[PDB]
Amino acid sequence: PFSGLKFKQNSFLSTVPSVTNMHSMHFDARETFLGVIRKALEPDTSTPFPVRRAFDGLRAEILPNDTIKSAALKAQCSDIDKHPELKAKMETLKEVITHHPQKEKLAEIALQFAREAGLTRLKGETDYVLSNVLDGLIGDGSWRAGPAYESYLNKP
């Protein structure tokens, strides 16, 4: 679908919040994490213009900057069964994510978000967009089983 699409490597690192802020009582794990993925998916300038404009429309629709648009997309994906076009777009974007040259690092960031900020606290009930993005980074889908936690009490 998007041949010749290239990304500037390490462009998304500056967008990852500090672990201390991930523990904030009003931290928005979904929006902040999707911001990292949006930044990581920003096409490199070396990509041909037709592909850039084509892909920029895909990620702009699926990973919008505006909170109003992001929330509207979230609600519209709750009944994704009635929105095949989003199904195709989300499927297309997930295909791009799984081929991202730095998918391993993005997977580590996603796991850090789940570990610290509770990104995947809903487990299997995660919204369609966030679940698809994670499935792209984590192919097996094991993240649906939330992070393992220490449970200090009753320790041997």
């Binding site: 904030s24 930044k39 300038t45």
Partner: protein, 370 residues
């Protein structure tokens, strides 16, 4: 009315065409919290823009969306522009054509994207991208002269004669205020002062702006500083601690004339200006020698004009008259020129209209704008 937004690397100078000074001047930074929690109703706002980020600087991680005159974080740049239009100017961008600036020899995708955002995200009726050096000449009122524009990200000089630019003679150095700021915090460690955070980098920038100056003769100034304490100045940090700096006052600006201080192989701004003039036609060099116009914050160091006068005079033939024009409104020369250009009746046909963008796309900027 037309909006003039001089989105520099360090500061955003925005206002309305026809005014004498920008209405809004705030830092071009987006700060996001880096600490934890912990109070209900006190952390809903993620990211702060401009002066608010500077005020809450202590708990944020500040980041400039523009580096070396190139927009590197377009999501943050969108936040900066949204802050400018709606929060600082209190205008609807869809009702005003917007003139904005950029440095010469920038990546073309930089102009293309900013054209794309202005038309598709803000629905501006029309827009224009001007060269900052050219606007400075508009502000000075001349039609001939070699401008030396040095802001936070990039320093460049554009030789213009009788209104004609010599694009083969443009110069660009990625050595500007921010590079000087970084050097100052590096040489401040020699006195035991450690500034490492982005919040503290702003304090070092304030120290630079308040205390740094250009020595007329560097070697003599170094000897004077070594031999006596007359050049030492004290500065009070936000928490009450007092720091004193001696030769660091003029060593930091000296990097402009000696880029090797920060490991750069390039030549000083004095020699780059002379090289730019030497690349121009021999018949116009005399006029350029007499119309070196400074603009940008990085040219606000005390004694910079006298140093540039001395350095170029030693390079140019002795029979030329070297004149440095450094207006007190140097720091806003670019915005003033943009305001002049935007309000010119003969300029109203040079806008990129929304209709033109629709037919041609973001590539229209390369045809309509220098």
């Amino acid at each position: 009315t037309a909006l003039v937004c001089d989105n520099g690397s360090g500061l955003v100078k925005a206002g309305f065409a026809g005014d004498d000074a920008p209405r809004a001047v705030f830092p071009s930074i987006v700060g996001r919290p880096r600490h934890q929690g912990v109070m209900v109703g006190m952390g809903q706002k993620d990211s702060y823009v401009g002066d608010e980020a500077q005020s809450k600087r202590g708990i944020l991680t500040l980041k400039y969306p523009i580096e070396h005159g190139i927009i590197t974080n377009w999501d943050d740049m969108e936040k900066i522009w949204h802050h400018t239009f709606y929060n600082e100017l209190r205008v609807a961008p869809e009702e005003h054509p917007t003139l904005l600036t950029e440095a010469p020899l920038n990546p073309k995708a930089n102009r293309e994207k900013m054209t794309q955002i202005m038309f598709e995200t803000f629905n501006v009726p029309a827009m224009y991208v001007a060269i900052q050096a050219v606007l400075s000449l508009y502000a000075s009122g001349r039609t001939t002269g070699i401008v030396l524009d040095s802001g936070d990200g990039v320093t460049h000089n554009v030789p213009i004669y009788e209104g004609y630019a010599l694009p083969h003679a443009i110069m660009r150095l990625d050595l500007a205020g921010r590079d000087l700021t970084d050097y100052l915090m590096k040489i401040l460690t020699e006195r035991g002062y450690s500034f490492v955070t982005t919040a503290e980098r702003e304090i070092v920038r304030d120290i630079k702006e308040k205390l740094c100056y250009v020595a007329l003769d560097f070697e003599n100034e170094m000897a004077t500083a070594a031999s006596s304490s007359s050049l030492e100045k004290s500065y009070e940090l936000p928490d009450g601690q007092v720091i004193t700096i001696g030769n660091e006052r003029f060593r930091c600006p000296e990097t402009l004339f000696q880029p090797s201080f920060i490991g750069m192989e390039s030549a000083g701004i004095h020699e780059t200006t002379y090289n730019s003039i030497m690349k121009c036609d021999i018949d116009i060099r005399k006029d350029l020698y007499a119309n070196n116009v400074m603009s940008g914050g990085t040219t606000m160091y005390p004694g910079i004009a006298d140093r540039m006068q001395k350095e170029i005079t030693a390079l140019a033939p002795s029979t030329m008259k070297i004149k440095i024009i450094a207006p007190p409104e140097r720091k806003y020369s670019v915005w003033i020129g943009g305001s002049i250009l935007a309000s010119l009746s003969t300029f109203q046909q040079m806008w990129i209209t929304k209709q033109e963008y629709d037919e041609a796309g973001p590539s229209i900027v390369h045809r309509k704008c220098f």
